[PDB]
RNA sequence: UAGAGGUACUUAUUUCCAAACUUCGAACCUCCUUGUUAGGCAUUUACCUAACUGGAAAUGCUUAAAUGAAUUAGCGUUACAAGUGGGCUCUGACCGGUAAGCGGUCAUGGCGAAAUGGGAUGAACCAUACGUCUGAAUAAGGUGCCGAAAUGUACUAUCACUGAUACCAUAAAGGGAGUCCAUGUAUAUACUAGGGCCCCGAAAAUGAAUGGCGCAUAUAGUACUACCGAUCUCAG
RNA sequence: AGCUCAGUGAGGACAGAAAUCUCACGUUGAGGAUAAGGCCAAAAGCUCAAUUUACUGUGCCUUUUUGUACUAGGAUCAGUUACGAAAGUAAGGCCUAACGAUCCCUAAAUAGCCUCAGGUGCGUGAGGAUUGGGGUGACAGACAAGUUACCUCCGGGACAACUGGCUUGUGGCUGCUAAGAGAUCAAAUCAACGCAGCUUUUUGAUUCUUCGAUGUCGGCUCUUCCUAUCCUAGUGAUGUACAA
RNA sequence: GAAGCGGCCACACCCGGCUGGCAACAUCCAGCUCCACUCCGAACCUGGAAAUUAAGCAGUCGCGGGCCACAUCAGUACUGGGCUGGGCGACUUCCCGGGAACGUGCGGUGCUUGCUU
């Protein structure tokens, strides 16, 4: 029957990976040399905008790597744009530029250098910017990507991204699409914007919400400002507490007495 | 013709009569170093005096 | 200790009572005095020396060896190292150890029936 | 057929002991160094780029430079007669910080704990220092079991 | 091994990178004008066999191959050396 | 031929297999280390006597089939292939070298070609057994005799308290066995663990 | 090596191995630290940082409290020059060799260049390393006589043209109702688990050597005192 | 930037032990120019695409200082390019071998920097400083075939032939065991396969003694010694009737 | 409790069962532009939201394989000093020191850095 694959002497032998590469969401070769600076400039952070896109949430972050762990300076997440104007297609293009403009605006607003950087930048006696990098992660670098829409956000919204490069912003390309399936199909214009027609948006509309979105998170950038934070931690729990209690733990006497009522079936017991 | 070729049988004994510490002069050695670090280490100097 | 772990096949030793440790510095105690190996002779000797650190005469010294109090090794280091002649009963085996039928190494108590016939 | 090379009788020491493959965490790069500061160089056998010889393994030295990836160390070899001085430089994933100093500086920071707290009573103060493990005390010992131990009658068993 | 004819390489005068056409350099048979040619002639005139050696025992058959990077903004020649090798050839694709 | 085996008792370097830098090899005169009721069992025949050398040194591989053949055929007079089960316990596998010489270039590349194999006892090694039933435990006593007079020093000819080949006392056997604790391969004995 | 279980392979086992195998891993080694350590203050920089009342580095000021293992010891530095560049060896570790008073390495010691005493005799082993003398008590080693000192006291073995003190001057596998001591069983007796000492195994050429004489309680082991004995030790 | 290899398992027209296709398991056993050993899995492997950092210039470090060099490698500074969205990476090949003095010649400069001693000289020509190449494998680097029995000299027991010594593989001699020969029957007599010794009457091995010389093979002649006894003296066994 | 970002990198892995989805993660639905398949909207990419916890994921169970921990294993193996100890030898008593491994027995099977609803 051919030789066993995964002996104990497999088993044994066998060296793991770390953890975030075996539930597989770090490339730690991007990671060593995402983090890494000049020993000539010693305890020195360097910023990096994370930019990770899931189904529905756009996440964006900025972070700051240390030994113990990295540390969030500041966060935005595109279910916050329902209060700026976006009620639907929170993970959109225009959605993902949105939470770019959140991430800027919100971390010049907490180092209050608000003035100082309004527009993208483009060089002496005048103040450096921040650099900031960006992570993508496992994500494919191709061109018009939603991770680099995010980055677009952040340039416009101040911060110096270095990188070498207005439609699908307001909007467009979504419009389009809209129309394609209302003109000819209009049975596929049910399946594919249901929500949008429950609003209802309309075709039309995606251009003029997006700019009075930008208007609104340049005004008022920073939000939901809660203390303390171990009450609010405390009341999640609660509000997201499953209904059905998740089985717990089995205690060391009661297996024992699990264990000796199987092998009565089969017989020598008791011990373990 | 065919004589011995080597011995390490007081060699012990010889190093023991005087393993003298060679003390290093100072822990800086600027032949060596980063250029750019020394280039600003002279600036500090230069303009401290006046 | 471990350092005479090394040199045991070397050295007899032992645990001295005070009646021993008397009778070597009242016979043949003498001063390391800037390195001149003087005899121990009259009390004025140790009182320059070790004045300073509390030990007027020798009795103060002797004292200060089986207490083994503060100032040890002050008047470990006054004492000039001893010099005894050969015993007589002479003893049964050189190159053995003493609890082996020999005698080199610890010999616990016993150390004062081999210095009474050195001296 | 005795040979001087460069990496010659290394077969154990630039293995990586045992699942301890692939590169290291980027933890270690992001590390930091400063002159003056005692460092114990141990060798990763994977990263190729910029290491010590074979002799520096396993060897204490204090850094002298530092630079963008890599730290010249100050370790003193054992030449013949006399110990030189070897200004290494070897990168940063080959060298550690070394924990040396950190019995003399634990002394030094409790002695001035105990120091100052002396006087804040004071009171007046007792002298700690550091003494090798000494002879004991008389006291007292009761037990309540005694095995007697004796030698038993041989037997083979085979 | 093969080479390109053309490649990039740093001008040493220009101060920049810039693309120059390289050829194999010229071993230049000697002048009877040099000084040491000069010492020579005069030296191996009279009696006494010849002077000077060459070299009997020569075993290795090869030759460390110099290029001649001739630029083509600056015009002058910078002199790159290869390894040593047994044939060299130029790139045709 | 054979040097005498005085010649290479003692063991004076590292051991030197058969691989890939020794290669000349011949094999060694041993192919059977076994004979006897090969098939047999632990409960059948529970009487073992063995053969221990009290000795450091090399045993030969001349010397251990002499052993087997000497031993089979006093065994097979007196009982008759039924009952016995012998096995040798050394495997010849350190190699022995010679300097030839057989004008002449002696102790110049003195390195020298494989003769023959080796194996390398160690004090109280058991070198041969003779597993049986009762009624033959005096015969394998008179054959393990005979066998001795064939190997290099002093060997002791004994009768072991543990049954068969396996490593338990007659007293634990019966206690394991009802336990249940031990089961029966096809031969020897495989332990139960309870895991 | 050799069986069993599955569909020659294969899943568990087993007999037994590796200087150029390693999933574990000692002893012996090796390297670093052990007095100044915590700060605070403000000048310098063309360097670093998004930024400076930051970082990095060196210049000074100064706020606290002490000399914070053992044992030993003065430490640092320079100049000029001799001889040498055949080594040998005990005890352990090791490579090659059937082995060698053989060849090639390793660690401490020794000889060479180290007397004296002891091993009868010996470069190397043991005690110990030395001015010229006078004593005492010892070391190694010895105490029938040669030969200085007990054929000492107490306790066990031994008959043989035999035995007799490290290195060492050769003897093995294998036998013995020789004698002494001895393990387990069976019925004073039969059967043996063995151990010492003694005998056999054990044959070379000038006549021959426990050193000799000789001994048989001057042979083989064990214990405890007395005693002789070096240029060591101690006293003058 | 994307992907995962070797292999095993099952499948699939012709299709077979091996063609191409598919899924599953797959810690790396494949592959990485070659020796051997390390090292490596969203790579250092394989594929695709764009490229020339296999670049220029001076110090520094390690191998190696009880001996400083060259080779090879390493960390930088000062440039400049390549590639990438970027952090960055690249100073050849994943890491350890793949190579070389003076002198002389020779090449590099759009044709440059200094000198040609009376000219701050004018063409040609020559000579310099700085950086590579031409080469020495005996690889710190002379330019080089034999023979001597016609031989000479200096020395060497640092080194052979020769006696002795140590050693005993080989030669010779003897034990222990028996697996059988011996009609039958292991031990009257032989004795395998094994194992343990002795001998210095063979020949080796070694280089301690002898090279300012122990006269070297055999025979002839005379002495003495050893026994591992062929005969003679005396004894025991037997497949010892007698004799041999 | 869930999610992005991580730290030590199997107490976290690997095989097989069971119990959960308010939001969140995900499967899933569709293919027009950005761009993607040396063929394929499977992947990658973009725009969705109908219905599900079947799978991933989370928690938990197994006289589970492995991994980790303690105790035995064992004062064994080996080993640093010392003897005018033994032994033809090979090796090895003893005195002063240090001290494993495999195996077996019982236990366990991830602990939380900073931000968010």
């Known amino acids: 029957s051919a030789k066993l694959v995964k002996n104990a ?18 490339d730690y070769v991007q990671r060593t040399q995402l983090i890494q600076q000049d020993k000539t400039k010693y305890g020195a952070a360097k910023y990096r905008l994370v930019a990770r896109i899931t189904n529905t949430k756009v996440i964006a972050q900025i972070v700051v790597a240390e030994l113990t762990g990295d540390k969030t300076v500041c966060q935005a997440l595109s279910t916050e744009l329902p209060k700026y104007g976006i009620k639907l297609g929170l993970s959109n293009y225009p959605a993902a530029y949105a939470t770019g403009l959140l991430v800027a605006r919100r ?6 250098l608000a003035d100082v950087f309004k527009t993208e930048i483009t060089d002496e006696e005048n103040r450096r910017p921040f650099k900031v990098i960006l992570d993508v992660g496992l994500a494919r670098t191709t061109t018009g990507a939603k991770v680099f829409a995010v980055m677009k ?99 060391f006497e009661e297996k024992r007495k699990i264990l000796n009522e199987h092998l009565v079936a089969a017989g020598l017991p008791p011990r373990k | 013709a065919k004589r011995s070729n080597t011995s390490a049988h007081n060699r012990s004994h010889q190093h023991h009569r005087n393993i003298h510490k060679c003390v290093v002069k100072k822990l800086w050695f600027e032949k060596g170093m980063n250029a750019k670090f020394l280039r600003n280490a002279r600036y500090a100097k230069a303009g401290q005096n006046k | 200790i471990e350092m005479l772990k090394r040199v045991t096949p070397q050295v007899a030793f032992g645990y001295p009572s005070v ?90 108590h016993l150390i004062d029936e081999l210095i009474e016939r050195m001296i | 057929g005795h040979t001087e090379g460069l990496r010659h009788a290394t077969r154990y020491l630039f293995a990586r002991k045992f699942r301890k493959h692939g590169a290291p965490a980027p933890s270690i790069t992001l590390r930091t160094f400063r002159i003056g500061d005692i460092v114990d160089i141990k060798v990763n056998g994977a990263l190729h780029s910029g290491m010590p010889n074979r002799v520096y393994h396993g060897a204490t030295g204090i850094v002298w430079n530092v630079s963008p990836h890599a730290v010249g160390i100050l370790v003193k070899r054992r030449v013949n007669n006399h110990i030189a001085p070897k200004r290494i430089y070897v990168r940063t994933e080959h060298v550690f910080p070394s924990k040396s100093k950190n019995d003399f500086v634990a002394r030094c920071q409790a002695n001035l704990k105990a120091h100052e707290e002396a006087k804040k009573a004071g009171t007046k103060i007792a002298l700690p220092k550091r003494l090798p493990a000494q002879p004991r005390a008389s006291h007292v010992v009761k037990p309540e079991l005694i095995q007697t131990i004796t030698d038993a009658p041989f037997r083979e068993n085979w | 091994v093969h080479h390109p004819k053309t490649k990039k390489f740093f001008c040493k005068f220009c101060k920049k990178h810039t693309m120059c056409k390289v050829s194999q350099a010229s071993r230049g048979e000697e002048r009877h004008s040099a000084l040491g040619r000069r010492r020579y002639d005069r030296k191996q005139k009279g009696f006494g ?45 | ?32 280390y076994e004979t006897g009721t090969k098939t047999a069992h632990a409960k059948e025949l529970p009487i073992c006597c063995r053969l221990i050398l009290l000795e450091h040194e090399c045993v030969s591989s001349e010397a251990l089939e002499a052993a087997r053949v000497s031993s089979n055929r006093y065994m097979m007079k007196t009982m008759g292939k039924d009952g016995y089960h012998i096995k040798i316990n050394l ?52 054959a393990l005799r005979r066998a001795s007079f064939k190997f290099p020093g002093h060997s002791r000819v004994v009768i072991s308290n543990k049954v068969g080949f396996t490593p338990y006392t007659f007293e634990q056997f019966k206690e394991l066995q009802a336990n249940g604790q031990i089961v029966d391969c096809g031969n020897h004995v495989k332990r139960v663990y309870r895991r």
Request: aromatic fraction near 10%; charged fraction near 30%.
């Open chain 1, 9 to 26: 002497g497999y088993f044994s032998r066998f060296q793991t990976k770390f953890r975030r590469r075996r539930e597989a969401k770090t």
């Open chain 1, 107 to 112: 971390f010049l607003t907490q180092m209050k």
């Open chain 1, 153 to 251: 956000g952040a340039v416009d919204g101040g911060l110096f991204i270095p990188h070498n490069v207005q439609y699908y912003i307001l909007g467009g390309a979504v419009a389009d699409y809209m129309r394609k399936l209302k003109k000819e199909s209009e049975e596929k214009y049910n399946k594919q914007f249901s929500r949008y027609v429950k609003a209802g948006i309309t075709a039309d509309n995606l251009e003029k919400i997006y700019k009075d979105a930008h208007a609104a998170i340049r005004k008022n950038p920073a939000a939901t400002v809660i203390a303390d934070k171990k009450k609010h931690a405390e009341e999640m729990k609660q509000k997201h507490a499953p209904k059905k209690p998740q089985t717990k733990k089995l205690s």
């Open chain 3, 19 to 108: 009646d021993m440790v008397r009778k070597l510095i009242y016979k043949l105690g003498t001063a390391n005095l800037n390195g001149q190996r003087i005899p121990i002779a009259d009390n004025q000797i140790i009182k320059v020396a070790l004045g300073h650190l509390c030990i007027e005469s020798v009795e103060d010294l002797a004292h200060e060896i089986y207490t083994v109090g503060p100032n040890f090794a002050a008047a470990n280091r006054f004492l000039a190292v001893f010099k005894l002649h050969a015993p007589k009963g002479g003893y049964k085996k050189i190159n053995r150890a003493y609890v082996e039928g020999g005698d080199y190494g610890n010999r616990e």
């Open chain 5, 49 to 93: 066999g010849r002077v000077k050696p060459i070299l009997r025992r020569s075993k290795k058959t090869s030759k460390k191959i110099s290029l001649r990077f001739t630029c083509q903004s600056c015009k002058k020649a910078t002199m790159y050396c290869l390894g040593r090798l047994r044939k060299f050839e130029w790139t045709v694709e």
């Open chain 6, 1 to 32: 031929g054979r040097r005498p085996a005085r010649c290479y008792r003692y063991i004076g370097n590292k051991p030197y297999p058969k691989s890939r830098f020794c290669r000349g090899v011949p094999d060694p005169r041993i192919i059977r």
């Open chain 6, 91 to 142: 495997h010849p596998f350190h190699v022995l070298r010679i300097n030839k010489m057989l004008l002449q270039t002696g102790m110049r590349h003195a390195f020298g070609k494989p003769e023959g194999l080796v194996a390398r006892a160690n004090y109280n090694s058991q070198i041969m057994t003779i597993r049986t039933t009762s009624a033959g435990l005096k015969h394998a006593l008179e």
